[PDB]
């Protein structure tokens, strides 16, 4: 005997109450599960796309069946192939580099006795596909160990600083040029320390000395040095050294 | 044939579903089931005889001689350490299949049969006509 | 709730599987006559051995032809055989995706 | 009595010419 009843449920509003023609048999797999515990566990494990909430019946067993809402059944291979263009996804033609990952599924199960009361993971490494912050495109492992893609002075910030400086009305052209050059240098090096500012000035003539000489804004540069000395930081010795280095660039 | 490509795609989907089903039943089929995704595919695998059993630790350390199969990069002769749950009870011990040594290898490694009389010497089959017998002891770890 | 994991089968694979299943049900009668776990093959007399009779079943290249007497032919004009008992050499022909070597390709060993 | 699970699945996966008719061709939808 052992009449088994299946009650398929969708949104709890539409139901289809059935009865297994072959008792103690998997309706999908056509497998002979001789014990109701074995049948329920096989349904729960092999046919994981459904959920089986055993509810018991006065005559036999009533198994309510519903579609597994979550059922994480995504691609289990290399996450890159989930976004490769058609014709190259799941190519399997050659070796593909992937970020290492370690999984432990079964370690030491308890192996308890069978019981109907039952019917009332660890991963190490990168376990997903990463995307670029800028372009929102998938990130290949070859571009992972380097290129953090977040640096001190973004190009938009530099362009905005240049535009803001050049957008002033009460400023000379060469003075605007030297101000923009100093701002770009500071952003490129990210000085935050007053003492470093001294060395900063030298670095300026080590990177913008030729540009200033070609632009012929040396007088404006030394005016900027004087203003900086007035704002503290740098020094008379620093001003002299920077100017002499600038003069040596012209003689070179 | 386009039909062959369509069958290949359907087969890939079915393989994914079958792997998901098998992983659902992994606890009921195996005692220990540890899956690690190497950076490069390995064409060879052979446990080294040496096993380390640290006192007071619930695991043991074994050495695996894995090869490398790089599409265009530098191929290697990986030697990795694997932690096994021993007899009773690991839950979380951080890295478990981390590598130990890596020797530069010209071309992908086809075999990694270690010398049995002295596991220091490990042989490898290069894609060329010459066979290389490495020695991970003499070579730098990095 | 937790994000939807974007099931891998999608609809193209599901449509192909539906077409293959409809073809299988129309050919081998697995669902109806096979009780959901068998392939029903319809034999047809081809040659008569006057010393039995040779019969070939409806699914071609699945089961080899056999020699049977006239009464045996009448009794077993239709043979129902479980998939587990199918010859492994030719059982794959029942469906292209029953087992396909996914990396056909070349090179390798 | 209320249909059968295997026949119900056979009334689900194929819904075309090769549906074997039978009770599937009958008022299977909407009970």
């Amino acid at each position: 005997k052992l009449r088994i009843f299946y009650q398929f449920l969708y949104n709890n509003n539409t139901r289809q109450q059935t009865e297994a023609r072959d008792d103690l048999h998997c309706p999908w797999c056509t497998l002979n599960c001789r014990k109701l515990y074995s049948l329920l566990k096989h349904l729960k494990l092999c046919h994981s796309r459904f959920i089986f909430n055993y509810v018991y019946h006065p005559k036999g067993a009533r198994i309510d069946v519903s579609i597994n809402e979550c059922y994480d059944g995504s691609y289990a291979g290399n996450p890159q192939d989930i976004h490769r263009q058609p014709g190259f996804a799941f190519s399997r033609n050659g070796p593909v580099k992937r970020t290492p990952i370690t999984h432990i599924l079964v370690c030491r199960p308890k192996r308890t006795k069978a019981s109907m009361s039952e019917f009332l993971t660890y991963s190490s490494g990168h376990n997903r596909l990463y995307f670029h912050s800028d372009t929102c495109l998938p990130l290949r492992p070859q571009e992972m160990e380097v290129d953090s893609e977040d640096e001190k002075d973004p190009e938009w910030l530099r362009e905005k600083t240049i535009t803001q400086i050049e957008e002033f009305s009460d400023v000379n052209e060469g003075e605007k040029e030297v101000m923009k050059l100093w701002n770009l240098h500071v952003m490129k090096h990210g000085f935050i320390a007053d003492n470093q500012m001294n060395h900063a000035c030298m670095l300026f003539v080590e990177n913008y000395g030729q540009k200033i000489i070609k632009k012929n804004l040396c007088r404006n540069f030394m005016l900027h040095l004087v203003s900086m000395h007035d704002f503290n930081l740098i020094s008379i010795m620093s001003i002299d050294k920077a100017v002499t280095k600038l003069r040596e660039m012209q003689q070179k | 044939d386009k039909e062959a490509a369509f069958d290949d795609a359907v087969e890939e989907r079915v393989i994914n579903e079958e792997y998901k089903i098998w992983k659902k039943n992994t606890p009921f089929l195996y005692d220990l089931v540890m899956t690690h995704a190497l950076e490069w595919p390995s064409l060879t695998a052979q446990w080294l005889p040496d096993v380390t059993r640290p006192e007071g630790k619930d695991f043991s350390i074994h050495r695996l001689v894995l090869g490398t199969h790089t599409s265009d990069e530098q191929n290697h002769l990986v030697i990795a350490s694997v932690q096994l749950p021993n007899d009773d009870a690991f839950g979380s011990v951080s890295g478990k299949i981390e590598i130990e040594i890596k020797i530069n290898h010209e071309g992908e490694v086809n075999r990694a049969r270690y010398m049995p009389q002295n596991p220091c010497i490990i042989a490898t089959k290069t894609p060329s006509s010459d066979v290389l017998v490495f020695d991970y002891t003499k070579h730098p770890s990095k | 709730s937790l994000p939807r994991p974007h099931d891998f089968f999608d609809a193209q694979t599901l449509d192909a599987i539906r077409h293959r299943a409809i073809c299988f049900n129309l050919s081998a009668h697995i669902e109806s006559l096979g009780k959901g776990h068998s392939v029903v093959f319809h034999s047809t007399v081809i040659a008569k051995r006057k010393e039995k009779l040779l019969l070939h079943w409806m699914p071609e290249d699945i089961l080899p032809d056999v020699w049977v007497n006239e009464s045996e032919r009448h009794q077993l004009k239709t043979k129902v055989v479980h998939l587990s008992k199918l010859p492994k050499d030719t059982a794959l022909l029942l469906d292209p995706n029953i087992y396909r070597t996914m990396p056909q390709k070349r090179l390798k060993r | 009595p209320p249909a059968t699970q295997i026949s119900d699945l056979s009334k689900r996966k194929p819904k075309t010419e090769d549906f074997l008719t039978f009770l599937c061709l009958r008022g299977s939808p909407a009970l």
Partner: peptide, 27 residues
């Protein structure tokens, strides 16, 4: 009703997948 058709399709997708798997696994 359309709800019945939606339920039938939502159960037909996994039912078809598992029926193909049942056919394939026995071989």
């Amino acid at each position: 009703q359309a709800d019945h058709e939606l339920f039938l399709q939502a159960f037909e997708k996994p039912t078809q997948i598992y029926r193909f798997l049942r056919t394939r696994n026995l071989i």
